[PDB]
C-alpha cells in the first residue's frame, strides 16, 4: 500500500490557492486523513475526509480556509484557499487500507508537502553553494580530511544537499545540519543557509585526480510564475560547487 | 483514547531502549499501534498488539495483563533510530486517533577518544572567505550559541564513517564580516 | 456450533438494487443497519440508540471492501450467475383478528435469491399505498435471504388482502391470499 | 433473468459458557469459499474458488493476530455491553382463545421466544389432538405461536389454555 502526495514543494504569494493531491496508488480508501506539522512542533490532525460525505474537521481549522474534496475512492485533495505566511508548514496526508495490508489500523502517510507563503516573490532567492577545502593541520593530526559545504542565500528553504565524489553520490561520512539557520534573524522573510560536512580519509583528498562536489537541489518557482525583477528568476534549479584534491 | 508518553529520551548506541506508554482508560474495544517518524518525512507503522507479546524485525511490544500500559522495546539502537515514536490506542474506526506529542528518542554515540579541536577551511575560489570547524568533541559537549548577529554557528551534527567504524560530532561556524578569526567559547 | 446467543454482522453487494446493505442481527433479529445513502446508523428500536452507538463508516468502508471482492470474484468465476431460487410467501396477522381493531398484516417472503424483489400490498384487488412498511433483506444460514412486509389495516367484513411478490425465479407474480 | 452478481460476508460471534467463538465467512453468490474460525486459528478455504484468497491472508501474520483477538476484542465486548436491552429483554405475551370444530390459542407479543403452551379440559391436561405451529418471528423483536386443539364439545366443559413464560411471575390462563 503506497500513498502519493503531490506537489512535494510549493512556493506562492499571499492570496494564492494551493491544491494538494493525496492519491492511493494500489488501494481505494473511503477516508483519508490530513495532518500538519510545524518546523519544531509535533503532528496535528487537520481534518478527516469521507467519500461522498462531509469532512470531519478537527478543532482549530476553518472549512472556509481549507477546502477538502474526496472526489473518488482513490483521490482526496486539500486546498489552501487564502495563502498567508502563517500557513507555511509541512502538510502530510494518510490513508487506511482495512482490506489489504499487514494491519487494519496502519495509516499510510504520503511523502509530504513543504509549503511556504511569502508576501512578495521578490524574496525568493537561489542558494549560493561553496566548498571549503580541508585543513592540513587536521590531516597531520588525525589522518583525516573533512570537507564542508555552505549553501547560503535561499529563502524558500526547499533544498536537498548531496555530496559527490568523482561523479557519484556518497552516503558515508556525510552529515548535514537538520535545521538551516537564518542569515538575519528578527526579520519576517530572512534568507537561510545550510551546511554539510564530508569527512574522508587523508589518502582520498591527497590524490590530485579526486573530484569532490556538493550539489544543492533548490525547489523554487515554475514556468507559470510571474518574475518582473532585474536579476535572474529563481526557478527550480541545481547549484553545485566543486573542489579537486591536493597533494602537498 | 488520548495517550501519555515521555516527551524525549536519551540513550547510547547499542543499548536496548524501552519506551513506556501509559493508557489507563483503555477498553475491550481498543487496539495498540505504534509508529515511527524520521525527520523530514511522515510517521510509519512498526508494531501492533492486543494482549499477547509481539516481536518483529523493528521492535518488540510488551503488554501486561491489565493492558493499562505498553512498552516498546527497540533492540540494539543505532544512530539511524533517532526518531519520534508515537503511541496510539483506539478501535477499528477513524474517530480521532490523535497523534500526541511523541517520544523524541535521541541516540547519542559513544566516543571514548575525544580530540576537541578547531580548524580553519578556505574556499576553492576566494581565500578571504573562510570557515571554522569544531569537530571531534564529546557527545555530552554542548555546542556554543551565537552571541553575535554577524557570527553564525550551526547546531552540532554527527557523522558515521562506516568503513573505519569512526564517528565524530562536528560543528560549523562562519562570519561574513571581515577581520574574523576562529575564536569560540 | 453451540451457543446461547449469536451476534452476526451481515452485508452484501450486488449489481441491481439494492446494490448494498450492512446490518447487524442479534438472535436472528436485525438490531441496526447503516443507510448507505444517508450515511447514518439506523436503529430498529429507539431503545437501542440511547444505549449504543455504531460508527457509520464501519459499514460504509466494509461495503467498499465487498465491492472489490465482488469484481474480483466475477472474473475468477468466469461470470457465473447463480440460479434464481423460488421465494416462499406466507401471510399472517400480528395480533388476533378482530373487527374494528387496527391490526398489522405480515407477509414473510423466505428462501429466495438474489435479493431483488417487487412486493406490493393489494386490498380487494386494488393497490394499498398507505400503511405499508418493510424490513431489510435479512440473511439466512444457507446464504439465501428472507424479508418482511407489513400492512397496518383495520379488519372489515368483506375485505380480503393479497401479497403480490415479483421475483426473477417466478415466471409470473405470486399472489398469497389471506382473509381469516 | 438480467445480469446480476453478488458478494456477501458474515461476522458471527457465538457465546456459550463465558466463551466467544468468531467465524468470518466470505461468500460469492450463495457459495461460501473462504472462512476464518477462531477455533481453527487461521483462514481456510471452503471451495476451490477461495484457495488463492486463504493463502494470501495466512501470510500477513498481523492480520492472523488480529482475527485471533476478535473473540476477545469484538465478541466479548459487544456481549458484555448489550446485556441489559438484549440478553435480559422481556415482553409479556398476550393470550387469546377463539372457537374458529377447532380451538385456537393465539399467543402473541413475547420476545424471549422460549414459551410453553399447554391445554386443559376441566383441569386435566390434554395432549391428543394438539397441533402447535413453529415459533413465528414477526421481525419486530417479538414472537408468536398458535396452538390449535380439536375437541369433542360438550355443554358445560371448560377449556383453558395455560401459558408459561420467563417474563411472567405466574402462568397466564384464558378459558372458553
Amino acid at each position: 500500500a503506497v500513498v502519493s502526495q503531490h506537489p512535494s514543494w510549493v512556493i506562492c504569494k499571499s492570496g494564492t490557492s494551493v491544491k494538494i493531491e493525496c492519491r492511493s496508488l494500489d488501494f481505494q480508501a473511503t477516508t483519508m486523513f490530513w495532518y500538519r506539522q510545524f518546523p519544531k512542533q509535533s503532528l496535528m490532525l487537520m481534518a478527516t475526509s469521507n467519500e461522498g460525505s462531509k469532512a470531519t474537521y478537527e478543532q482549530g481549522v476553518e472549512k472556509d480556509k481549507f477546502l477538502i474534496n474526496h472526489a473518488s475512492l482513490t483521490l482526496s485533495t486539500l486546498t489552501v484557499t487564502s495563502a498567508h505566511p502563517e500557513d507555511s508548514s509541512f502538510y502530510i496526508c494518510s490513508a487506511r487500507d482495512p482490506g489489504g495490508g499487514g494491519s487494519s489500523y496502519e495509516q499510510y502517510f504520503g511523502p509530504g508537502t513543504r509549503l511556504t507563503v511569502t508576501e512578495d516573490l521578490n524574496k525568493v532567492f537561489p542558494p549560493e553553494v561553496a566548498v571549503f577545502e580541508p585543513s592540513e593541520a587536521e590531516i597531520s593530526h588525525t589522518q583525516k580530511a573533512t570537507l564542508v559545504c555552505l549553501a547560503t542565500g535561499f529563502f524558500p528553504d526547499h533544498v536537498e544537499l548531496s555530496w559527490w565524489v568523482n561523479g557519484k553520490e556518497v552516503h558515508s561520512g556525510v552529515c548535514t545540519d537538520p535545521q538551516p539557520l537564518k542569515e538575519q534573524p528578527a526579520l519576517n522573510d530572512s534568507r537561510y543557509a545550510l551546511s554539510s560536512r564530508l569527512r574522508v580519509s587523508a589518502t582520498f583528498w591527497q590524490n590530485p585526480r579526486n573530484h569532490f562536489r556538493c550539489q544543492v537541489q533548490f525547489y523554487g518557482l515554475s514556468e507559470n510564475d510571474e518574475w518582473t525583477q532585474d536579476r535572474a528568476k529563481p526557478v527550480t534549479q541545481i547549484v553545485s560547487a566543486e573542489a579537486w584534491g591536493r597533494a602537498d | 483514547a488520548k495517550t501519555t508518553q515521555p516527551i524525549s529520551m536519551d540513550s547510547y548506541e547499542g543499548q536496548e531502549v524501552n519506551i513506556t506508554c501509559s493508557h489507563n482508560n483503555i477498553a475491550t474495544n481498543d487496539y495498540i499501534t505504534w509508529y515511527q517518524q524520521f525527520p523530514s518525512q511522515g510517521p510509519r507503522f512498526i508494531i501492533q498488539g492486543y494482549k499477547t507479546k509481539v516481536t518483529n524485525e523493528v521492535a518488540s511490544l510488551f503488554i501486561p495483563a491489565d493492558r493499562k500500559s505498553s512498552t516498546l522495546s527497540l533492540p540494539r539502537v543505532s544512530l539511524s533510530d533517532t526518531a519520534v515514536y508515537y503511541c496510539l490506542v483506539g478501535d477499528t474506526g477513524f474517530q480521532k486517533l490523535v497523534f500526541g506529542t511523541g517520544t523524541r528518542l535521541l541516540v547519542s554515540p559513544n566516543i571514548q577518544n575525544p580530540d576537541p579541536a578547531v580548524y580553519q577551511l578556505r574556499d576553492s575560489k576566494s581565500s578571504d572567505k573562510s570557515v571554522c570547524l569544531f569537530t571531534d568533541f564529546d557527545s555530552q559537549t554542548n555546542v556554543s550559541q551565537s552571541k553575535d548577529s554577524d557570527v553564525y554557528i550551526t547546531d552540532k551534527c554527527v557523522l558515521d564513517m562506516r568503513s573505519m567504524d569512526f564517528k565524530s560530532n562536528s560543528a560549523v561556524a562562519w562570519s561574513n564580516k571581515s577581520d574574523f578569526a576562529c575564536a569560540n567559547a | 456450533i453451540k451457543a446461547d446467543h449469536v451476534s452476526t454482522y451481515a452485508a452484501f453487494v450486488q449489481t441491481h438494487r439494492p446494490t448494498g446493505e450492512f446490518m447487524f442481527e442479534f438472535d436472528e433479529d436485525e438490531m441496526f443497519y447503516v443507510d448507505l445513502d444517508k450515511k447514518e446508523t439506523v436503529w430498529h428500536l429507539e431503545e437501542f440508540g440511547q444505549a449504543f452507538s455504531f460508527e457509520a463508516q464501519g459499514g460504509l468502508a466494509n461495503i467498499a471492501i465487498l465491492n472489490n471482492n465482488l469484481n474480483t470474484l466475477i472474473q475468477r468465476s468466469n461470470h457465473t450467475q447463480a440460479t434464481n431460487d423460488p421465494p416462499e410467501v406466507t401471510v399472517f396477522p400480528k395480533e388476533p383478528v378482530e373487527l374494528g381493531q387496527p391490526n398489522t398484516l405480515i407477509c414473510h417472503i423466505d428462501k429466495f435469491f438474489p435479493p431483488v424483489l417487487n412486493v406490493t400490498w393489494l386490498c380487494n384487488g386494488e393497490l394499498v399505498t398507505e400503511g405499508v412498511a418493510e424490513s431489510l433483506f435479512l440473511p439466512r444460514t444457507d446464504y439465501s435471504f428472507h424479508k418482511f412486509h407489513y400492512l397496518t389495516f383495520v379488519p372489515s367484513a368483506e375485505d380480503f388482502y393479497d401479497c403480490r411478490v415479483e421475483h426473477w425465479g417466478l415466471d409470473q407474480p405470486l399472489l398469497k391470499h389471506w382473509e381469516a | 433473468t438480467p445480469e446480476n452478481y453478488l458478494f456477501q460476508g458474515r461476522q458471527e460471534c457465538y457465546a456459550f459458557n463465558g466463551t466467544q467463538r468468531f467465524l468470518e465467512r466470505y461468500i460469492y453468490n450463495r457459495e461460501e469459499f473462504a472462512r476464518f474460525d477462531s477455533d481453527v486459528g487461521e483462514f481456510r478455504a471452503v471451495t476451490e474458488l477461495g484457495r488463492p484468497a486463504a493463502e494470501y491472508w495466512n501470510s500477513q501474520k498481523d492480520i492472523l493476530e488480529e482475527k485471533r483477538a476478535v473473540p476477545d476484542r469484538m465478541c466479548r465486548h459487544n456481549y458484555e455491553l448489550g446485556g441489559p436491552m438484549t440478553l435480559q429483554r422481556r415482553v409479556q405475551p398476550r393470550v387469546n382463545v377463539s372457537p374458529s370444530n377447532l380451538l385456537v390459542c393465539h399467543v402473541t407479543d413475547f420476545y424471549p421466544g422460549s414459551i410453553q403452551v399447554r391445554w386443559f379440559l376441566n383441569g386435566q391436561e390434554e395432549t391428543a389432538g394438539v397441533v402447535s405451529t413453529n415459533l413465528i418471528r414477526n421481525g419486530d423483536w417479538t414472537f408468536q405461536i398458535l396452538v390449535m386443539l380439536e375437541m369433542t364439545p360438550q355443554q358445560g366443559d371448560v377449556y383453558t389454555c395455560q401459558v408459561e413464560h420467563t417474563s411472567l411471575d405466574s402462568p397466564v390462563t384464558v378459558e372458553w
Binding site: 482490506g99 | 478501535d91 477499528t92 | 452507538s53 | 484468497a53 459487544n78
Partner: peptide, 12 residues
Amino acid sequence: TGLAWEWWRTVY
C-alpha cells in the same frame, strides 16, 4: 456505548 466491528479482508 461504542460497539465493535471487524474488517472483511480483500480477496485477490
